[PDB]
């Protein structure tokens, strides 16, 4: 875990899904999703898509283990939605690291 960088908080963005059911679900549940990302240092990646991919998996893993020792279950709808917003968040983090 000393191998990761833990970024500072950012505002969680709004994601849109193509139905009002999901847009609403998202908006109503999003406070339960993370607002900072874990990443490996920039100097290990030769490009953005690879940085982002790793950031998503690691961030999601840490968030799922730390809230499950707090009696929070995430459904498959939840992880699918975290996939999407952590992705945007990791991209923003990538931009923070490139000036």
């Amino acid at each position: 875990l000393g191998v990761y960088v833990l970024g500072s908080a950012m505002s969680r963005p709004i994601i849109h899904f193509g139905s009002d059911y999901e847009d609403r679900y998202y908006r109503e549940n999003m406070h339960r999703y993370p607002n900072q990302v874990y990443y490996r240092p920039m100097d290990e990646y030769s490009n953005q898509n690879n940085f982002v991919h790793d950031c998503v998996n690691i961030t999601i893993k840490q968030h799922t283990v730390t809230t499950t020792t707090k009696g929070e279950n995430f459904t498959e709808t939840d992880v699918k939605m975290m996939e999407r917003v952590v992705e945007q968040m990791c991209i923003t983090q990538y931009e923070r690291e490139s000036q």
Partner: antibody, heavy 116, light 107 residues
Framework: EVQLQQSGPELVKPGSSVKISCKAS????????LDWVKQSHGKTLEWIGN????????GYNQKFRGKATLTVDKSSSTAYMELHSLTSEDSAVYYC?????????WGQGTLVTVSS | QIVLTQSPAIMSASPGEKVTMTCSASSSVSYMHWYQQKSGTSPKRWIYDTSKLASGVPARFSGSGSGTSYSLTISSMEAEDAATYFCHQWRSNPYTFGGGTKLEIKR
């Protein structure tokens, strides 16, 4: 195939409280949403709040905070709405409504009469 | 919050007539939902996500709009369609309903 049974009509004294139920009878979904809605004098519709029965998350209309409390019994698929401190403005029909993507179902409603 | 105004409030149409009723919003919404209520029964979702029909809803119904302006159209008025129709938004809390359009048929 899913059906929402709501509990039956209630006559309550002003100042009292009452709890009504809505159970999802045949349901197979994981994440669905349940809205609670009030209709006054068979006309005007108001959103009270919701719950995702599985697990936890609960939203209120600010106007009904302190008036309604929403909970869920997940082992028996039953959602509850507690109404606190009834006055005559609380007499109405109260609906629960299930949503899951394209599908929606309303319960048949619960008539609450607040009267001495 | 977001105030939904429906018009007209009460309308009469004859059979076979094209009918249009409008719901407009004080600020933008992404999608609109419409509900039918016949007297004595509970509301039933009729069109969701602006223009998709709920199950059991006849083909002659349709929906459209964007921004602050939405409509429900019946291509060809039938006796069974006489009811009250409400629009509804899920854009922000509190979710709100319009005041209804009461639709009657001429005979």
């Amino acid at each position: 195939e899913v059906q929402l049974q709501q509990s039956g009509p209630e006559l309550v004294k002003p100042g009292s409280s009452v709890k009504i139920s809505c159970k999802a009878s045949r349901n197979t979904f994981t994440d669905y949403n349940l809205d609670w809605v009030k209709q006054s004098h068979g006309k005007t519709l108001e959103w009270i709040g919701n719950v995702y029965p599985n697990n936890g998350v609960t939203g209120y209309n600010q106007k009904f905070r302190g008036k309604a409390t929403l909970t869920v019994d997940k082992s028996s698929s039953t959602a509850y709405m507690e109404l606190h401190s009834l006055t005559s403005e609380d007499s109405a029909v109260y609906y629960c409504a299930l949503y899951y993507y394209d599908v929606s179902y309303w319960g048949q409603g619960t008539l609450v009469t607040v009267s001495s | 919050q977001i105030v939904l105004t429906q018009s007209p409030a009460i309308m009469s149409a004859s059979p076979g007539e094209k009918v249009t009723m409008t719901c407009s919003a004080s600020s933008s919404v992404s999608y609109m939902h419409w509900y039918q209520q016949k007297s004595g029964t509970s509301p039933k979702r009729w069109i969701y996500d602006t223009s998709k029909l709920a199950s059991g809803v006849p083909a002659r119904f349709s929906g459209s709009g964007s921004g602050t302006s939405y409509s429900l159209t019946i291509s060809s008025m039938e006796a069974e369609d006489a009811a009250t129709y409400f629009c509804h938004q899920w854009r922000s809390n509190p979710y709100t309903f319009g005041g209804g359009t009461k639709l009657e048929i001429k005979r």
